[PDB]
Amino acid sequence: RREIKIEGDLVLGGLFPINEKGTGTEECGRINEDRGIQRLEAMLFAIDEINKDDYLLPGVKLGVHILDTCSRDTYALEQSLEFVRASLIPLLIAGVIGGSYSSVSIQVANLLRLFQIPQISYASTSAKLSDKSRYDYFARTVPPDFYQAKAMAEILRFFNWTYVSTVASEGDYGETGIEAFEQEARLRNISIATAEKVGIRKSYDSVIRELLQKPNARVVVLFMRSDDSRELIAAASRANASFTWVASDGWGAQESIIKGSEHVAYGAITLELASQPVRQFDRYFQSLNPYNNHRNPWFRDFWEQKFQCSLQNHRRVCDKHLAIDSSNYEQESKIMFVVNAVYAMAHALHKMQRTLCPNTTKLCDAMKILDGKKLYKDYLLKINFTAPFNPNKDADSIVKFDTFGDGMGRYNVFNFQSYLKVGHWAETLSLDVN
Amino acid sequence: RREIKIEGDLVLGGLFPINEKGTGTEECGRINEDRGIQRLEAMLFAIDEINKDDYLLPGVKLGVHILDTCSRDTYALEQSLEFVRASLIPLLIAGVIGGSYSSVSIQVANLLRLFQIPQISYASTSAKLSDKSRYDYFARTVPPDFYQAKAMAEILRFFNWTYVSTVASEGDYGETGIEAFEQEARLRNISIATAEKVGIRKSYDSVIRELLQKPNARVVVLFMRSDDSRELIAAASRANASFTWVASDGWGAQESIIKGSEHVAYGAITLELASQPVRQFDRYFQSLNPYNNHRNPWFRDFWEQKFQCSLQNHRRVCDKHLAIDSSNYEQESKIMFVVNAVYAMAHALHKMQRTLCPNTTKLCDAMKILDGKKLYKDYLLKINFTAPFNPNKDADSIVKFDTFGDGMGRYNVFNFQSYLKVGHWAETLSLDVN
Numbered sequence A, B: 001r002r003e004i005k006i007e008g009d010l011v012l013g014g015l016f017p018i019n020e021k022g023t024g025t026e027e028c029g030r031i032n033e034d035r036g037i038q039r040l041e042a043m044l045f046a047i048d049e050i051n052k053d054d055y056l057l058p059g060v061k062l063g064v065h066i067l068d069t070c071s072r073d074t075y076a077l078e079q080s081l082e083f084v085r086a087s088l089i090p091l092l093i094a095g096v097i098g099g100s101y102s103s104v105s106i107q108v109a110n111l112l113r114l115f116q117i118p119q120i121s122y123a124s125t126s127a128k129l130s131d132k133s134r135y136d137y138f139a140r141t142v143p144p145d146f147y148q149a150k151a152m153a154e155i156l157r158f159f160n161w162t163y164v165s166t167v168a169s170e171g172d173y174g175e176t177g178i179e180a181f182e183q184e185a186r187l188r189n190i191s192i193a194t195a196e197k198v199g200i201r202k203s204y205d206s207v208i209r210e211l212l213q214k215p216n217a218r219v220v221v222l223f224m225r226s227d228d229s230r231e232l233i234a235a236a237s238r239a240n241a242s243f244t245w246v247a248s249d250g251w252g253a254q255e256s257i258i259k260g261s262e263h264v265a266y267g268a269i270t271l272e273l274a275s276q277p278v279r280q281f282d283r284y285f286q287s288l289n290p291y292n293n294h295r296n297p298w299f300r301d302f303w304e305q306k307f308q309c310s311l312q313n314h315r316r317v318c319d320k321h322l323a324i325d326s327s328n329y330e331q332e333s334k335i336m337f338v339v340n341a342v343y344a345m346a347h348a349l350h351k352m353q354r355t356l357c358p359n360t361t362k363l364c365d366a367m368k369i370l371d372g373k374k375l376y377k378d379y380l381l382k383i384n385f386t387a388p389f390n391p392n393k394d395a396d397s398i399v400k401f402d403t404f405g406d407g408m409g410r411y412n413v414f415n416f417q418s419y420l421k422v423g424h425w426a427e428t429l430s431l432d433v434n
């Protein structure tokens, strides 16, 4: 199999959806450029930055064992066995960075707790992962999706919107989120007219009718995914219904949802995961090409797929001058979370080495037989640090986890006109005038 | 490491506490003769009997991969990695037989569900293992300890004992059992005077006083372990209190508990796991000696430890004529459960091969890429068969599992005089005149 194995005094395992879930027969499909290639390179970028940082793990070199998940649960577990074979050629696995999808992260967390291997995910937002009776070694730099509920209800409780109607998607997201919203609304005196769930355009048209049948609530709180949100706005367009929507990140600040139904959408309050681009990362990512990137065994497949050419005769040959640049690259939204996950692990290990190895920077016999239980509970859960590549080194650039290992809730608010950043929800709400 | 690896068309993995949990530093201590050696040999005995049985898996040879757990959770998981490395030299692991202790079985179940490997335990009685949201691939031939509660309360509800007092041990056993009793008593109108829990002889003496403080209940339902039960009867002896005890298998029909306090114990109704000895097994077990048993790599250690001699110079040499016989061997209480667990797996696989391989006895390509999900839910959970070595082939010799994979509740009742078998509790109660 394909992998990135780089020796180090301590090794962080990594799991990324380098490939899309394979079609019917096959395990893996094409290369996931954004969630796969970029997120993987952001790990390598952070490891490289930590290994040049004399104030972080000055005498401990970080190594990596990066593996593809193929955006599948089973494939990720088979791969994860490398991290656990080690725990017993396999390396000194101090922790695991990943995965992306929550189904992957859940299955990996299930294997990892058995061997006391700390795990930080940069993208898995399911609420299930907050259950420490099941995922006791899991932590994440991204907040759980249920925090959007707390935030959305605060946007209502500010604007005193007490009589509100709700629509929710089917599955883990909609159901766990809306249930969290209901409970947070009940806590803040807010009432529900109709709780419509959604598993044909006529089905969404039926939901709009039930939303009209209670004309008392103008405010409709939405906790749906992208495709669901887009077809319920077109369903509100067909019936020409005028509702002020307060939607989750499934809608967010994207054009996909509002395409051809802009009129019915005006003045909708949406949520989006606040993230700041890692500038130094853009420079590193764009500098990569098949001539300089031999350490990534997927980079040639990535390149060949991106530029639709062959590096190697009925295929068109790749131009030696092709480049990842401003015309074809835009930093993936979760890069900041990948970098912060890697550094949280580095910060935890650095405080551990500092404590367990008095009068040395080097990995002493105590750290050599790593107590994962101690690393997670005593170091990882107790670290707070300014994000490494955040320009404004303020209180909202602090990387910390609550008692459940969940990252800090940081969402932005977006008004519709044209999406406009009308505020944020950190621990508390913030809005302007729109 | 030490192991029993025997090739077969299908392989059953096995886990047994061959060694006692090691002292402080060490992982493994001495050889557990009864729960380790015997239970392991009962697996090998059943595999041998199935491989001679032309009506059970006629054209599929069962192989084994038997490993030591060292009566530890971590050691069992490290070993279990052999079963999962296979699932991907490692063999075709169709299922796992074990472990003994519930902490071992819980940790193994946690690894095994990930790889869809069915698991049958012959001894793990914890209630936690009935939770299919956690242990979805686990089943057991032994019933969960909480069934004793249902049975004990029926002994009260027969004799109309409605005003009853309770004492419970600390930990998984006492607490889960007594809570199950309370709920089953509340269902049957029975009331509780004092619910005394127990984590010094004076501490048990305090409990007896609280039991006296409510002189209304003569009946005291006990859900404690052996050591706890023995010190609460001596505590009732010191204070000279006369209570009719209705106790769980922690007390059962053993002399250990009643030693020096026989008077206070008279007329106590105790529970014990009903099991019938496997006669053909006694013949096989006693026939074993270091000359004929090379397949068990622990048998020389077992022998050397049992007879306190060396097979190999300051140690006394083993007499070539020493033998496991009536003077030193008594079939371990759970042997029947080991044999039944192995056969339930064989019966499940046989019905699977029969269905998935029309017009052949041999392992066809469908069975070669085994669906553990199907084997467990569709075959293992749906098998019912007369116990292989049970003389009276009646309805109480049926090996079956409920929807949670739990084996059939079969306990015996024991009156004190001298312990006397005064009845049984199968699905319903049965008693005589005593």
Ligand SMILES: N[C@@]1(C(=O)O)C[C@@H](Sc2nc[nH]n2)[C@H]2[C@H](C(=O)O)[C@H]21
Pocket: A035, A100, A101, A102, A103, A123, A124, A125, A126, A225, A334
């Ligand atoms: N938030 C995610 C999570 O699984 O927690 C969900 C998926 S996105 C998706 N695709 C279909 N439904 N949802 C992935 C996102 C990311 O990789 O940024 C994580």
Ligand SMILES: N[C@@]1(C(=O)O)C[C@@H](Sc2nc[nH]n2)[C@H]2[C@H](C(=O)O)[C@H]21
Pocket: B035, B100, B101, B102, B103, B123, B124, B125, B126, B225, B334
């Ligand atoms: N019933 C058991 C289970 O763990 O389910 C409990 C232990 S016995 C024990 N020793 C200390 N406390 N309890 C073991 C018994 C067996 O091997 O027959 C299984």
Ligand SMILES: [Cl-]
Pocket: A015, A016, A017, A069, A071, A072, A099, A100, A101, A104, A105
């Ligand atoms: Cl993933």
Ligand SMILES: [Cl-]
Pocket: A170, A171, A172, A173, A174
């Ligand atoms: Cl979902």
Ligand SMILES: [Cl-]
Pocket: B015, B016, B017, B069, B071, B072, B099, B100, B101, B104, B105
């Ligand atoms: Cl065990």
Ligand SMILES: [Cl-]
Pocket: B170, B171, B172, B173, B174
């Ligand atoms: Cl216990």
Ligand SMILES: [Mg+2]
Pocket: A050, A051, A052, A053, A054, A055, A056, A057, A058, A059, A060
């Ligand atoms: Mg450094």
Ligand SMILES: [Mg+2]
Pocket: B050, B051, B052, B053, B054, B055, B056, B057, B058, B059, B060
């Ligand atoms: Mg046969």
